[PDB]
Symmetry: D2
Subunit: 331 residues, 4 copies
């Protein structure tokens, strides 16, 4: 009778389905930049966005929706509740309390565990076999919170860690040789913040033992400027926000780069946060970041690097900072 | 003890998985071009290639394998048997008996149903809920064979149909206006070969009723050159092979464009082959191609166009050609 | 002596170059979303961002810079001046005075011509043979301003027009059939705002004369709900901002889709703004949008559609609204 | 009068242009695979294909042409002559005399310099400022021939070198750790064939000094299986052809990966062939491959690695093999 009933013909049984989604908790600039980009790629055919600030969301959501004619992801849903997350393959938590010129440290912490207790677990009740990337901040300590508060195998529960930083690093690093940050290699681990031990021991622009930045050593630590790449790194997180008044794009790209790996089962190794519970001297459910291999099923395996006496020193140190911090609950 | 046992750390339980594959039966130039391209995109994280010509395959396969460092699909497997297809989401049959300057018609037919009886069903015993794209040729009649020989809902069993042709068409068509074949629209259906009724009734370069090529009518059929676009289309299939001695690339791209749609659940409508069993006068399990909507779960729905008295005429006609042909078995 | 002087060897003459850039004036949410996306593609190997709000820029800029390790565009520059735009191939003006719940109409107009007189011309003194996409708003009237104020051939001076709207349209439109907005076709022209005559005469979901939405006509205008798709369209621009408090993503994607076409010389036809100076009755340097073909060198050619008596009516009407408005200068 | 003259409107002056092309000499399987892939990306908006086997070409060419509706490159041209190459940015020579089970060595050499004398120079007379990637084989010695026979700055004249091999390597290498070949690093240089000194000194799976494969040393050379990765590498070139009867895909991907870098000015370092004329002891216009940085303008700079006494030994050796070979002309 209708144009519908006239133009289109409904091929009988099996006229409904479902499968493999992406969901992002909260669309604060970040939650959001980590959105669009999941889109400017084909990671997900259903991307559901869960926020509690109902207003902006159905606004932002509809923006993406109007945007359809460009995406390669037909379904884009939104909810005020986690029911709207049913059967996600990957959930990315980016809700809490973001940034303030000065503030930013692990200050947004007792503050966020609260955000979590609520936000996180519950999401999980929905997509029971989900896999979580934690972006919030605090990534370490939150990964821990979530880890704890959720109760599924770390592998499933992962964190943004230093994937970010390391990248921030490869950038600057390459800013000096005149070589692509893809084409220079260096690792920064420990904490995602100011306890960041880069790990010069292993820094190419060709190969290990091959072009290790060490063999030509204008030092790299023990002097002659390069420490600064590292001081530039850390500070670098800060300087951004002071100016645009937040940390957006670059966090996004990072994550989607984590997703990319997980989803396409790339088994591309990564610096992410996990339980170093009993690695290089650390023996206490401290989650900091370490180079790990990521696939379909989470963290598969870990990569146990060669930190020099103190590279291990420093790391041993973060571990601990990060550690008492965790004498937790809402108490 | 080992570098393995030394460099990498095995994150305990859940160190194995599996999920959503692509498989291509036979790697004859086509089977193959329809391969690489599935690769120069991220449709599949596991693409298994099943051929019986064991030799060339483990050669070609290894070529792609050496090729890893570029692909975004970690696993690429090969088999002499269909066991190597376990739990594919999409199987693409491109094995039979391909082309010969002159030959090419629906000649490669009794010839191929044979290829099928064997090849097809069996593949299915493995990935029971698979979805099939039939490229072989004969696409129509084979779709039918396979349909029949397999026994799963058409929706699942699909064919290359004219997606190809229509594209071949939009090309030429646009070759004259100086407008992109994306940006010109026209549909050619019926048979994939020489019974190809384009369907001028509906041919934009803007909109329907809007810029329909009809309203300015330097005719389009009933004279003044354009029939030729169509004569150029059909012939066009032939001229290729005469020269490179086969039909490769363009068939590939087409298919992957079918996959793309299926896999990312795009619900992008397409001209593909299916059972017009009881549409526009045809009432007999004749499979020719018609504009249909494709998603995750197969053909979802059909699009019932407005063929003019004879557009319906011609189509009614193919249907039938195609039809007795189907008084089949190996008999 | 140095690691530089040690690791890398400088292959003598020809150790410097330059060529084909993208530049975006102002990074207000939009200027910005229209940024990242130019990045989540390979349109430009040098993208310079010119803003006057020096603060946020060197913040936002550095955000993208830290972001390097993901981009396929090595150079990302920023300036407080247009000198920083030298030899751009495409400049996209997105600076002025953006949005306000209610406000939004062609209010941001005397306001912006001012923004222009300054911003625009000057940019041009730098990249003399540049090509401009105008996003600001007002797109029509601004295209005109810029056109005027710059003095290069429209072809070069283009505007966002309704590429946006039409897309906004294909969306909703497809929201009802259950078909992709790529796979449904419809055109909305005239003004980018509330004088938007869609152009039902030509609306497929197959072909013109073929599946024109007209032949089944649950009307489309002259009743039985569809006008609303159009009322939904226009309103649709408004509802967004009311909520997220601005119009970001979808404008971005649109533009980059214009760039894409221009840059890769796609000669993909588009609804954009240009001088309808003497088309369908309009005879006065009124710039509204019409379906045009875009390539390397600008607008190449125009597409002269079939508006029904009044489709031509309405268009004839916008033209004029838009027209007196243009009895301009700063006077 | 015509639909053309009716549907489309010709926006006056500037209705013609030109700029930045890709050209590939000969479409032998390789010339060809290195074709399609340049397409399954947006490297070129005009790709001209020059072959002398006029027949297959206008066949293969037309195949790609029919293929339009998928490409993001509007113009695809073909010639029997080099006139059809006018103003290419990148020319890729892949014509000569390809492969034979056994044969393959630097046998296809006096044979090819001939192919060159003709093919190469002449191409250049057309696109005088072109940049050449040499794929033929012999890549080394041919790079040299071409270098010589053309007369433009090496930087411009480059070769496939070991980009290939190294990749072939990262593959196998990663086949053992269970880590992506992107995520494992190792370099193989010297000759592209059997004089391939990998360069274990520098082989990560993290960082240099960091995860160098050396520090855990199940040796890597001086025993305990890994030499084989290398023996597997070289042999690996051979085993392919024996089976599919040629080397296609993987060479293609490699090149396009060279183009990608050149064209988008990525300044991504690469192992390619160039004049090691006076590096690590070699002092004679011997072209073998070394890690170099590639951009818009050619090889920009070289990367002078740390070969161990003999890594330098072996390299010193190839150099020379490769060297007398070059006491050339057609004499």
């Amino acid at each position: 009778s209708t144009v519908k009933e006239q133009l289109i013909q409904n091929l009988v049984p099996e006229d409904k389905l479902s499968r493999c989604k992406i969901t992002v908790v909260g669309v604060g600039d970040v939650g959001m930049a980590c959105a669009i980009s999941i889109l400017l790629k084909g990671l997900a055919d259903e991307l559901a966005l869960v926020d509690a600030d109902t207003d902006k969301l159905r606004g932002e959501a509809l923006d993406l929706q109007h945007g359809s004619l460009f995406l390669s992801t037909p379904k884009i849903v939104f909810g005020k509740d986690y029911n709207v997350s049913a059967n996600s393959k990957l959930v990315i938590i980016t809700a809490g309390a973001r940034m303030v010129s000065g503030q930013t440290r692990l200050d947004l912490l007792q503050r966020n565990v609260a955000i979590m207790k609520a936000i996180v677990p519950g999401v999980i009740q929905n997509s029971p076999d989900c896999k979580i990337i934690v972006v919030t901040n605090p990534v370490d300590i939150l990964t821990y919170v979530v880890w704890k508060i959720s109760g599924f195998p770390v592998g499933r529960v992962i964190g943004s860690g230093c994937n970010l930083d390391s990248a921030r690093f490869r950038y600057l690093i390459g800013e000096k040789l005149g070589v692509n940050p893809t084409s220079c290699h260096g690792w920064v681990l420990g904490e995602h913040g100011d306890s960041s031990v880069p790990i010069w021991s292993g820094v190419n622009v060709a190969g290990v033992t091959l072009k290790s930045l060490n063999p030509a050593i204008g030092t790299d630590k023990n002097k002659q400027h390069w420490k600064n790449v590292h001081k530039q790194v850390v500070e670098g997180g800060y300087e951004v926000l002071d100016m645009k008044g937040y940390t957006s794009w670059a966090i996004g790209l990072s994550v989607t780069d984590l997703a990319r790996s997980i989803l396409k089962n790339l088994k591309r190794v990564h610096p992410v946060t996990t339980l170093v519970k009993g690695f290089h001297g650390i023996k206490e459910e401290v989650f900091l970041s370490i180079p790990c291999v990521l696939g379909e099923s989470g963290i598969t395996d870990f990569v146990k690097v060669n930190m020099t006496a103190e590279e291990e020193g420093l790391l041993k140190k973060s571990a601990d900072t990060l550690w008492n911090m965790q004498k937790n609950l809402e108490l």
